[PDB]
Amino acid sequence: MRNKIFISHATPDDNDFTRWLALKLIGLGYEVWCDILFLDKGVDFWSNIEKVIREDTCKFLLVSSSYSNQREGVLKELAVAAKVKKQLKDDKFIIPLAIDEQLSYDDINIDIVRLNAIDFKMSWARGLKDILEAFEKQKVPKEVADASKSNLLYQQIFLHDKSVIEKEEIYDSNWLSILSFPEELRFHEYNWMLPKRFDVRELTFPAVRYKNYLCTFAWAYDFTYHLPKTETYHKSKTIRIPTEEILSGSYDSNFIRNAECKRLIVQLLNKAFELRMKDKEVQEYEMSNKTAYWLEKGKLEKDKFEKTMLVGKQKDKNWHFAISGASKLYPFPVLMISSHIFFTADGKKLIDSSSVQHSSRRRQGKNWWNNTWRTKLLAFIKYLSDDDTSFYLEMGSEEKVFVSNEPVKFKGNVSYNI
Amino acid sequence: MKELIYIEEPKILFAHGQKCTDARDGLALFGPLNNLYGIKSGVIGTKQGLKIFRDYLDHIQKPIYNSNSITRPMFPGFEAVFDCKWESTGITFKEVTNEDIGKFLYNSSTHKRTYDLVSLFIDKIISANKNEDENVDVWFVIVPDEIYKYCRPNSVLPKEMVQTTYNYDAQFHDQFKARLLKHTIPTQIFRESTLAWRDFKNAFGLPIRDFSKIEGHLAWTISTAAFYKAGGKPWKLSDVRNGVCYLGLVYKKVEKSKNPRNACCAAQMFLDNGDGTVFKGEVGPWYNPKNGQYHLEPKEAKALLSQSLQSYKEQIGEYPKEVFIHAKTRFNHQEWDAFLEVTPKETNLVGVTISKTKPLKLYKTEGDYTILRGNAYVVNERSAFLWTVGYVPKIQTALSMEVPNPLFIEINKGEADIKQVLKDILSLTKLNYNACIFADGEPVTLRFADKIGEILTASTDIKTPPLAFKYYI
DNA sequence: AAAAAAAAAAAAAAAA
RNA sequence: UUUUUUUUUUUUUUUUUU
C-alpha cells in the first residue's frame, strides 16, 4: 500500500526546514520518506527514489524555494511525481510548499503554478496546520502509533483554535459613579468659636479644619449641637467656592490651590461614606490601611440579599462578604469599591488572629471566580441602596452626595468563548 | 459606558526566524535561538541530596506529562526542545556533609547562621572554580529544607533545637548570590522539596508541594532557567523598534548601612546592530540618603543616565533616539532636569510610571472567566490602564487566580504616544528568562531590576557588579 | 497630629 | 529559593494646614 509522504526539496540548502517538517510529520504518525534522513547509504539512490515515488508514495510534497525551481534533481522528481499523478488519477498528488518570501508567484515553475500551494512563507506553523487539515480532508492514511504524544502534538499545532475574536462585550467595574455634588464648598471661619483642641472627626456632618476655616459642604449652623459657640456665626464670613470650578480645576489662588482643594473633597467624601456606613448598621473589620464593612448574621433575611448570599457557613467559621471604599477625583469623580472576606466564629465576634483570617480567606477564595465576586459585589451595593438608582451620603442637612449603585460599565470590541 | 481598546499580542522570535506568542509552544516546535553543545552542571550538596538531583535530571530527560495539556503544554524532554546535552553523567559533585551543616545551622543567631551556611557553600564553589581542571557552566546548589526554614529573617529556631557578619542580609539566597558576584559563577539554588517532592510527607499523607498535575510546567521552568544560566538564548523579542533603550528603575532599602540609603538599580534592554536583543542590567548602585526619598540627586541621576547612554553608544555606535524610562515610583522635576543635560538634543527622553495600586477590577457580565488579557482603558493622552494579567484563550484560563488588577501606566515625563507605550510594556512582559510561562504580569525591566537590586543590597563590599542576568536570577 | 496621594519589606496561600 | 499570581500584616516619606 502507498502510505508514504515524499518530500522533494533542495537537499543541501533547504535541508533544515525539510528535516523539521519530516520530523513533525513523523511525530504525527505520518510515514515519511526523505533523502536526508531516510535514504540508505551505499544504494543506487535514483532507483530507490523511483521505487518510492512510483509504488509507495501516497502523497508528494514539493518544497518550493528560490533554489528549488530550476535545479535538475527537483525537476526530475517532480516529473516522476506528475507521471504517477496521471497514473493514479489523483489531482491532489503534488502539493507544493512555498517557504521563500522572495519567490514571487509569477516566477514559480509552471507545473506547480497550476497547482495550489500551502503557505509557509510567513509562519511554519500555520503552514503545518494547513498541511494537516488538507491531509485529514484528503484522507491520507496515518498509523496512530503513540496515540497520546501524537494527539497532544496535534492539539499543540491545531495554538490556532484559540485566538481573539472581534465582538463587542460589556464589562462591569467596581467604580460607583458620583452622580451629584453640593453646590458650594464652604469654609466657615469659626475661629475662637471652634475649640482648637477638638476632634473634627466627631462632627455629625463631615468637616475638615483648614487654617482657621472649617472645610465642609454643610450649612454654617449645622454643627451647633457639638459647637454651641457657633450659634452667633455670621454667614457673610464664608468663602464658598463653586464646586464645579474645583472639579474643573479653574479656581486657583493664594487662599487655596487646586491640588489642596480637591484633596479636601476626597477626605470629606470618604468621611461621609464612613458616616453613612455607621448609619446603615454594618459591622466593620479594622484592616491595616483601610477599613471594611461586613454584614452581621441575622440582620438581613436568610443572610441572602436579592438572589445572592453574602454570609455562608464553612466548617465552624462563618465567612462574611465585606467591602471597603475610597473616593478619587483624578480620572473621574468615582467611589472605588474593593471586595474582601472576613470570618467570624460565632457570627458576631471576629477572629482575632490575622493569620487565621488570611488562611480562611484564601481557602474561601480559591474557588470564587468572576461571577462569584461580581454578583456578591452588586448584591452588597444594592443592599446599601436608598432608591432604585442611587444612594446618598449625608454631607449636609440640606446638601447630599448621591452615588449610584450601578458601577461604571466598560465596553470592549473583542471577546472570546468557552 | 466607556471605551476599552485591545492591543495585539506580542510575538517572540525563535529558531529559524519563526515567531510565536507563547514560549513553551515556541520552544517545543522550533527550539532555542542559539545552540549549546552541552551543559556541564556542577552540584554542591549532601550525598543524599545529589540522588534527588540525579533522579530529577533523569526524569526531565524523558517526556513529562501534566493532567491538562491545553493550559500547560507537555514537556517533550530537554534535548528534544533545546537540542542540548544535559546528562547526569559528568556532574562535578562537591561534598557538603550533614554534620558541617548541623554545626552552623543549630545556632540561635539568625545572621551568623546564615553567614556560616552561605560561607560553607561559597568556599567550596570558589575552590572548585579556581583549583580544579573541570569546567562547570552552571553550579546547582541543592539545598535542604530545614536550612530554608531557619535561614531567612523572622525564622525562630525552636528552643529544643538550640545547640549554640551583621553587615549582610539574613536571607540565604540573596546573600549567596551577592557574595559570588566577584567570581562570576552562574548558579541555581534548588530546594530539595522543589526537586523530587514526593518523598516529602505530611501528617495527612498528601505531598506538601504537590506538583503532580504541574510536572510539565515545573520541568519547563527548570529547563529554561538552566538553559539561560548556561549561556543559551531561549527566545527573542521581534516587535522592538530600532533606536529604543528602556531602563527600569526600582528603589530598594538597605538595612546594613544606617538609614535605608535607598539603593537604586536599573535593568536595561535595547537592540543590537542586526536583530539580536541586548538585555543586561545597568547597575552602578547609586545610593540615596533620607529614609523615604526614593528620588535621585542630580549627580547620581546624571551618573545613571550617562552610564546608560554609554552602554548604548559603545554597543551600537550612536545615541538612542528615544529612551523610555520605566519606574514603580513617580519622578519629580529634580531628576528630569538633571537628566536633560545628559541627553543630547536628538534624544527624546520619556519617563513612565507603572503601578499596581489602582483598585480597578473589570468583571464581565456573565461567565466564570475574567477579562481578556490585552484590554486597555486609555484615560487620556497621558495616562492609561492595561490588563496585562487576565484571560488569554491559548492558555485556556486566566493568568491570575481571582479577578486581577491592571497596570496603571502613566507617562509622568516626556510626551510619548500612550498606545505605543502600552505596545512596548506588553512586549516587555514576555522576556522572563527565570520562568517559562505565557507572560508575566509586570514588565521585565522592573522585575529583573527588582531582582538585581535585591541581590546588590545584601552585600556590603560589592564593587562594580557584573551586568549579566546569569549571575542574578 | 490629623489627613490624602505615593512608597518598600515580609509572610501566607494557590495555582501556574 | 522552579515559579507566577492574588491577598494580608506592617511601616514610611513628601505635600501643605494647624
UniProtKB/TrEMBL annotation, chain A:
<feature type="binding site">
    <location>
        <position position="8"/>
    </location>
    <ligand>
        <name>NAD(+) 1</name>
    </ligand>
</feature>
<feature type="binding site">
    <location>
        <position position="115"/>
    </location>
    <ligand>
        <name>NAD(+) 3</name>
    </ligand>
</feature>
<dbReference type="Pfam" id="PF13676">
    <property type="entry name" value="TIR_2"/>
</dbReference>
<feature type="domain" description="TIR">
    <location>
        <begin position="1"/>
        <end position="148"/>
    </location>
</feature>
<keyword id="KW-0547">Nucleotide-binding</keyword>
<dbReference type="InterPro" id="IPR000157">
    <property type="entry name" value="TIR_dom"/>
</dbReference>
<keyword id="KW-0675">Receptor</keyword>
<feature type="binding site">
    <location>
        <position position="71"/>
    </location>
    <ligand>
        <name>NAD(+) 3</name>
    </ligand>
</feature>
<feature type="binding site">
    <location>
        <position position="116"/>
    </location>
    <ligand>
        <name>NAD(+) 2</name>
    </ligand>
</feature>
<feature type="binding site">
    <location>
        <position position="11"/>
    </location>
    <ligand>
        <name>NAD(+) 1</name>
    </ligand>
</feature>
<dbReference type="GO" id="GO:0007165">
    <property type="term" value="P:signal transduction"/>
</dbReference>
<feature type="binding site">
    <location>
        <position position="73"/>
    </location>
    <ligand>
        <name>NAD(+) 1</name>
    </ligand>
</feature>
<feature type="binding site">
    <location>
        <position position="116"/>
    </location>
    <ligand>
        <name>NAD(+) 1</name>
    </ligand>
</feature>
<feature type="binding site">
    <location>
        <position position="73"/>
    </location>
    <ligand>
        <name>NAD(+) 3</name>
    </ligand>
</feature>
<feature type="binding site">
    <location>
        <position position="105"/>
    </location>
    <ligand>
        <name>NAD(+) 3</name>
    </ligand>
</feature>
<dbReference type="InterPro" id="IPR035897">
    <property type="entry name" value="Toll_tir_struct_dom_sf"/>
</dbReference>
<feature type="binding site">
    <location>
        <position position="117"/>
    </location>
    <ligand>
        <name>NAD(+) 3</name>
    </ligand>
</feature>
<feature type="binding site">
    <location>
        <position position="77"/>
    </location>
    <ligand>
        <name>NAD(+) 3</name>
    </ligand>
</feature>
<feature type="binding site">
    <location>
        <position position="105"/>
    </location>
    <ligand>
        <name>NAD(+) 2</name>
    </ligand>
</feature>
<feature type="binding site">
    <location>
        <position position="115"/>
    </location>
    <ligand>
        <name>NAD(+) 1</name>
    </ligand>
</feature>
<feature type="binding site">
    <location>
        <position position="77"/>
    </location>
    <ligand>
        <name>NAD(+) 1</name>
    </ligand>
</feature>
<feature type="binding site">
    <location>
        <position position="46"/>
    </location>
    <ligand>
        <name>NAD(+) 3</name>
    </ligand>
</feature>
Automatic annotation (TrEMBL), chain B:
<dbReference type="InterPro" id="IPR036397">
    <property type="entry name" value="RNaseH_sf"/>
</dbReference>
<feature type="binding site">
    <location>
        <position position="473"/>
    </location>
    <ligand>
        <name>Mg(2+) 2</name>
    </ligand>
</feature>
<dbReference type="GO" id="GO:0003676">
    <property type="term" value="F:nucleic acid binding"/>
</dbReference>
<feature type="binding site">
    <location>
        <position position="434"/>
    </location>
    <ligand>
        <name>Mg(2+) 1</name>
    </ligand>
</feature>
<feature type="binding site">
    <location>
        <position position="472"/>
    </location>
    <ligand>
        <name>Mg(2+) 3</name>
    </ligand>
</feature>
<keyword id="KW-0479">Metal-binding</keyword>
<dbReference type="InterPro" id="IPR012337">
    <property type="entry name" value="RNaseH-like_sf"/>
</dbReference>
<feature type="binding site">
    <location>
        <position position="473"/>
    </location>
    <ligand>
        <name>Mg(2+) 3</name>
    </ligand>
</feature>
<protein>
    <recommendedName>
        <fullName>Piwi domain-containing protein</fullName>
    </recommendedName>
</protein>
<feature type="binding site">
    <location>
        <position position="434"/>
    </location>
    <ligand>
        <name>Mg(2+) 2</name>
    </ligand>
</feature>
